[PDB]
């Protein structure tokens, strides 16, 4: 689908916050999500997945208050809790506006694409990151995309970050193709 179609899809699943926030930056986050293949976005929409953009801390939302003080998986030793984490992906998606870029409380290439990749993995693709096919790819290429002690340890995180590289822009797409050829082909074939 075109960018126009994907933004149309995203206008039906993206939820904007009540309080004040940077409207232009929220729009920029939507624009980057619009690079995701429309097949995935419409599957998320069919499953009533909402992409919640947040004006404050994740745990300030009523539905995430249960995570206050909880140490996220893989963040052991960081001294941080979910209160300080700018994004969440999986059965739901919640993203703090303004924290997209690497270094804004995270080291993902892009916050919203990484988090939405987790939701696509889990909701649309039946946890494909844990499939035998992807485990063999992850075993070979899981350390070729940096942050090897994190991406190289958790297949779901390698899937999510590889997904983000594939769709952020053409430079990251090409960088993935050179560093992780089997992962690139896997994602290319997955999208038809």
């Amino acid at each position: 689908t075109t960018i126009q179609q994907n933004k149309d899809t995203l206008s039906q699943i993206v939820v904007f916050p009540t309080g004040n926030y940077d409207k232009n930056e929220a729009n920029a986050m939507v624009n980057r999500l619009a690079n995701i293949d429309g097949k995935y976005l419409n599957a998320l929409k069919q499953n009533n997945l909402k992409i919640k953009l947040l004006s404050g801390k994740l745990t300030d939302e009523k539905e995430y208050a249960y995570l206050k003080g909880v140490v996220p998986k893989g963040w052991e030793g960081t001294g941080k809790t979910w209160d300080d984490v700018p994004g969440l992906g999986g059965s739901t998606v919640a993203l703090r506006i303004g924290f997209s870029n690497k270094g804004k409380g995270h080291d993902a290439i892009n916050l919203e694409l990484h988090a939405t990749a987790h939701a696509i993995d889990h909701i649309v693709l039946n946890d494909i990151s844990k499939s035998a096919q992807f485990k063999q790819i992850f075993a070979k290429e899981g350390r070729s995309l940096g942050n090897v002690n994190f991406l190289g340890v958790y297949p779901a995180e390698f899937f999510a970050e590889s997904f983000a590289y594939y769709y952020l822009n053409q430079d990251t797409n090409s960088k993935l193709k050179s560093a992780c050829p089997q992962t690139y082909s896997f994602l290319q074939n997955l999208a038809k």
């Binding site: 996220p72 998986k73 979910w82 059965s91 995270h106 889990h122 994190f150 999510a160």
Partner: peptide
């Protein structure tokens, strides 16, 4: 299921 971003 919840997953945090890369630290």
């Amino acid at each position: 299921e919840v997953n945090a971003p890369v630290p």
